[PDB]
Amino acid sequence: VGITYGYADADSFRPVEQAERFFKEKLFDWTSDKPFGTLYVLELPKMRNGWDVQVSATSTQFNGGSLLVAMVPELCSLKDREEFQLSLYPHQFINPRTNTTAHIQVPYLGVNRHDQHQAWSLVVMVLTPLTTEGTVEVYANIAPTNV
Amino acid sequence: VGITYGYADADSFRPVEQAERFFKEKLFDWTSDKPFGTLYVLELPKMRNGWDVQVSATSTQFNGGSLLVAMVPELCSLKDREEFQLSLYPHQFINPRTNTTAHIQVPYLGVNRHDQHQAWSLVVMVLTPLTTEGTVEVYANIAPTNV
Amino acid sequence: ENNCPDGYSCGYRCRSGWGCSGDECCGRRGGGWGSIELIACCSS
Amino acid sequence: ENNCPDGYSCGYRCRSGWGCSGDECCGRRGGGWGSIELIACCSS
Amino acid sequence: KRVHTDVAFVMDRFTHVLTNRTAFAVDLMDTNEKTLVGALLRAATYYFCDLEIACLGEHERVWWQPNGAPRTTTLRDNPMVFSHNNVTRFAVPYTAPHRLLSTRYNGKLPSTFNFGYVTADKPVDVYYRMKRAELYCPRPLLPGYD
Amino acid sequence: KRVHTDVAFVMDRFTHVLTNRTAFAVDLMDTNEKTLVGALLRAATYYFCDLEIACLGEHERVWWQPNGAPRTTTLRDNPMVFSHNNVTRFAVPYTAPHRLLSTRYNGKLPSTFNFGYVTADKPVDVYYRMKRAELYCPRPLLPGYD
Amino acid sequence: GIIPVACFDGYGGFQNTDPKTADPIYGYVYNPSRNDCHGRYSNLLDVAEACPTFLNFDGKPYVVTKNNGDKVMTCFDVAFTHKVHKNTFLAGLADYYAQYQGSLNYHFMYTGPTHHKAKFMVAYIPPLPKTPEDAAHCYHSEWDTGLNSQFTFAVPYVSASDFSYTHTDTPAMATTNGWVAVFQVTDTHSAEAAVVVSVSAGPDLEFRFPVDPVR
Amino acid sequence: GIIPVACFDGYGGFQNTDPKTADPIYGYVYNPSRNDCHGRYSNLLDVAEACPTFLNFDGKPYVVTKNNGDKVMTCFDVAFTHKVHKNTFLAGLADYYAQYQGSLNYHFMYTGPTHHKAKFMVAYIPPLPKTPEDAAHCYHSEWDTGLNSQFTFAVPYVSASDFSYTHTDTPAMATTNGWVAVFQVTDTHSAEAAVVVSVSAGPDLEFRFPVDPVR
């Protein structure tokens, strides 16, 4: 639980940016009928800017499951066995019993210093099917930083 | 006469291990009917451990002979003329008039640092036929060290 | 003793948007490659 | 004079299992290749 | 200390990329996706290197044009290397206009992601070598064979 | 001071090991048991060296795979050396997982006791050279000829 | 005034891994800089240590608790060629290297309801009995899902040889690499849960001898 | 800007004993260590000096005392090609070397009953009479089997040339290498005994010019 800064600079954290705009959107209905690997990919944007996404879910003490929320840079496609290595990307876990809310911030990334071109894609995967003992909804809050 | 430390380290003797278990077994009846070259090979064991064997014989002042007791590492086979160079290995001589008892200690030896594989084999050769003026028996005491 | 949750260590400079006077945050490497996670400030 | 039997010389550190206070034993290079033989302690 | 997993060590190898070609772009994605160099290159989003091109085969000379130069059938006074013992090895600088090259692109890769163009007198077999290779943003890597 | 009977001096020689083979393991027990290098090696229980391989014959190039690599009919981008004047000399580093190799084994020697695998374009004559040999636990040595 | 040399036979052929450099064409190029770029990694295994990747339990990364009395949720080898590790980044990285040595870290995450607390023990069985009492004399560790729903289980390297072979063929061999297994000590199971398992390279793991598999 | 050279004719051929090294393939390998290993020998003759090996007296290493009056037990040459030395480590090591020079140490061990004490003299007869009186003017020594049943008889190098030939053909030549013989001074023989004889290289022995025997 906390705030994840993907591809962070080691020197910059030795002992600035901020979110300018805001947005909200529902992604999918988290239900037990979706097994592992139920990907939901959202390209960003839906100016040399870094993104800041706060994916949240509505879960109670009787809800169980796990979502993997990551930001893949230039996700053209995902192969059959590639999902298992998604943790290679700036990612977080949403668990109803641990944090039930994700927050990832990534810098500008590209071949050039100015972008047009979906550089980043927010990917949400259902790592484990939803378990209960009454529906769970996922809402994504996306805000550009340092435009 | 004494205790032989085969393949000893020169630095270690410049100015630890000990026997954990114990065992005894009769090997053969030392008799005059066996000429030179009557080999008796005993594989060890019959864990990264060094061995400590005390081969002894029952000889009196009227008994004469000689046994070559050695520990050949990885003795697959012994050729026809290979017996004469058996002294190239950690060995001791059993003479009824000199010591009538052998004691050899060897360290762990192998390609790897952990063993399964008969790394060491106790070989007893009748260097000279037994002479008298009433039977001689050979008993081997084997004890692993630093298991 | 350091006042950080389990698995969190100090010595990480707080990034903009945390309001920590000492500029020491309970940093934690994880979440990908090169990712650094901050959860709160560090108090000594 | 050194108190060792014939062919035995001091200057060999006693290995474990002899209980020599001076840590000097009547060593004797023999018995194979690299073999070192100890028979007793060394007294001066 | 681990040495054989260093990127600058692994990528510093001549990999066979294409066989029996006379004129070709020097797109580093021409490498086989199952070889060591190609697989570890495709496991990164971005990269940068100075290349070495080796042409093996019966050929007299090889012309190389930097990235952005116009494509023409006949090359005159362009960088030209004569073959010695039917081998032509030469180091190509990073001529792309971009700061870094990318294996993937969420737009097929545009034509600007190459190290130039190469023409040969006769068809040759080509080997690529990444000198001082730098990789960025690691991507999933999967076992090529089972 | 004795020099010509030093282990690091005697074993530092090219010994003919096998003739007219295109693909062969680099086991050091292929040496002739009567040669100087092949007989003193068998007079040791264990050893360690950085082998040098020389191939003589009409071959374009030769390959070499490190110990443990899978055996395949075709080799792509594996360590490859082209022949110069019909000679291919290349230094093979010690590759076996074990700390020391052994001439004997009380358990035939298992396949892990080799310096790799070598495949040639055409059959060649092979010579082994033990660089920085280190023998252990000397074994009986007998006159090869009377 | 001429240096006498001698062109030796054997050297001079085109080696694909030679240390020698070539002659540049445009020798006076100066690319600006790449210092302030993000995500650079100069070592492959450094990526594998900080990026745990999930396991393949019959197409899924999690393990379902069983109501029947067996006390063994999973029993998988520690071999990179095993089908369990098939999808991991380490196995993908191990396919291109002949040999390896070092330790592995296995990460376990519990994704069940917060009300249900379960206690799990992870046992390593060096090269085999499948009981906690026999695993007591072996390497083992126990973690309760009431303090941290995240457990790391370092697997020591106990292979006989100094280095092991990345490529091998052992389906369920008793001496494969140590048979990591997960035991649930609580027989009072309430309902179905899940345990996500992922593996990351240890701080001392080291691959060697890069190999191109042409199998 | 080009260094002028000249490829000489005669050099550059493949020599099987050339000092030059080759170009490594994997030049960044580092094998851990072999310092704490046992039994390493860096010199072959050092092994031969510390490891005496028995002689071949018609298939046996010992000598049977004769009741008849001859005062001679054995009379063997000091040649490595002689059938007596055939089974020794020195002869096996001498087969691969063209020349040698130095001294030999002959070890004699008495393996009879403790009650029976006998006195033996060992004589070296340089290149020949077989009597102790004639051996008095020659090199000889005497040891009694009542103090130490282990005798060392150093054989000096008295060959005409600085180095001798390891390979030769002299069955019982009067000038082979010195005709080491063993004499028993006590004619009061009691019963049958044995004398184990072995040879080890002297501290000054030195082989040279390694060769491959293809005889």
Please provide a written account of the structure.
Chain A has 147 residues and is an all-beta fold. In chain A, 0% of the residues lie in helices and 39% in strands. In chain E, strands 1, 2, 3, 4, 5, 6 and 7 form a seven-stranded antiparallel beta sheet that branches. The longest helix of chain E has 7 residues, at 36-42. Chain G contains three helices and 14 strands. Chain G is mainly β and 215 residues long. The chains are: A mainly beta (147), C mainly beta (44), E mainly beta (146), G mainly beta (215). Strand 1 (3-5) of chain B pairs antiparallel with strand 3 of chain D, so a sheet runs across the interface. It is classed as virus like particle. The entry lists the keywords dissociated, pan-specific.
Concise overview:
Chain C is built from no helices and 3 strands.
From N to C, what is the helix and strand string of chain G? Answer: EEHEEEHEEEHEEEEEE
Please count the helical segments of chain C.
0
- Written as H for each helix and E for each strand, in order along the chain, the element string of chain C is EEE
**Radius of gyration of CA atoms of chain C, rounded to a whole number:** 10 Å
**Biggest chain pair interface:** F-H, 51 and 46 residues
Hey, roughly how much beta strand do the residues of chain C contain?
Answer: 35-45%
Q: State the secondary-structure class of chain G.
A: mainly beta
Integer count of domains of chain G = 1
Helical content of chain G stands at under 10%
Overall strand count of chain G? 14
Shape of chain G: elongated
- The CATH architecture of chain G can be given as Sandwich
Q: Which CATH first-tier class of chain G would you pick?
A: Mainly Beta
Q: What is the third-level CATH name, the topology of chain G?
A: Jelly Rolls
Physical arrangement of strands within the biggest beta sheet of chain C? 1-2-3
Shape of chain C: globular
Which percent range fits the helix content of chain C?
under 10%
Subunit structure (chains A, B): Interacts with RNA-dependent RNA polymerase; this interaction allows 3B-2 to act as a primer.
Organism (chains A, B): Foot-and-mouth disease virus serotype SAT-2 (FMDV)
Subcellular location (chains A, B): Host cytoplasmic vesicle membrane; Host endoplasmic reticulum membrane; Host nucleus, Host nucleolus; Virion
Family (chains A, B): Belongs to the picornaviruses polyprotein family.
